[PDB]
Amino acid sequence: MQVILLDKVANLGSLGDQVNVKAGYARNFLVPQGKAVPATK
RNA sequence: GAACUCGCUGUGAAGAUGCAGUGUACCCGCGGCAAGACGGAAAGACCCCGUGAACCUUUACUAUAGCUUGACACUGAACA
Ligand SMILES: [K+]
Ligand SMILES: [K+]
Ligand SMILES: [Mg+2]
Ligand SMILES: [Mg+2]
Ligand SMILES: [Mg+2]
Ligand SMILES: [Mg+2]
Ligand SMILES: [Mg+2]
């Protein structure tokens, strides 16, 4: 799952970095805690 | 089924009131008895048959609930 990082996340990247994560990591952590957003445009 | 519904010895789907031969016997009740009418009752339960049934058994066959195995999914993060 492609997401855009918003907060600086460790072992991933920085603000605006396009990165592929496992869907569970995005769905259950990064998105609900406001660390990433889905790469919608 | 209908009867004007005797004995005997034979004959005969082979154990006869009903056939043959023969013997006996006037017509009709009532009380009794059960030897026979292969008496009545129940489409033999035994026995066999039907490519009949049911339920039961099991290391008969084929399945299958359940139980159990792993893969993928729900399921992610740091090195090992
Ligand atoms: K006679
Ligand atoms: K009798
Ligand atoms: Mg006789
Ligand atoms: Mg009498
Ligand atoms: Mg009597
Ligand atoms: Mg009888
Ligand atoms: Mg019969």
Provide a descriptive summary of the structure in words.
It is classed as ribosome. This is part of a larger assembly, with one chain. The chain is an alpha+beta fold and 41 residues long. The chain has one domain (1-41). It has one helix and three strands. The protein has one helix at 23-30; strands spanning 2-5, 18-20, 36-38. A three-stranded antiparallel sheet has the order 2-1-3, with no helix packed on it. The two termini are 14 Å apart. The structure holds potassium ion (2 copies) and magnesium ion (MG) (5 copies). The structure holds one RNA strand of 80 nucleotides.
Number of domains: 1
Assign the structural class, choosing from mainly alpha, mainly beta, alpha/beta, alpha+beta, or little secondary structure: alpha+beta
Count of alpha/pi helices? 1
Which strand order spans the largest sheet, edge to edge or round the barrel?
Answer: 2-1-3
Total beta strand runs: 3
Strand content: 15-25%
Query: How many strands, which pairing sense, and closed or not: the largest β-sheet?
Result: 3 strands, antiparallel
Terminal-residue CA separation: 14 Å
Supply Rg.
9 Å
Shape label: globular
Distinct ligands: potassium ion, magnesium ion
User: Helix-strand pattern, N to C?
Assistant: EEHE
Work out the helicity level.
10-25%
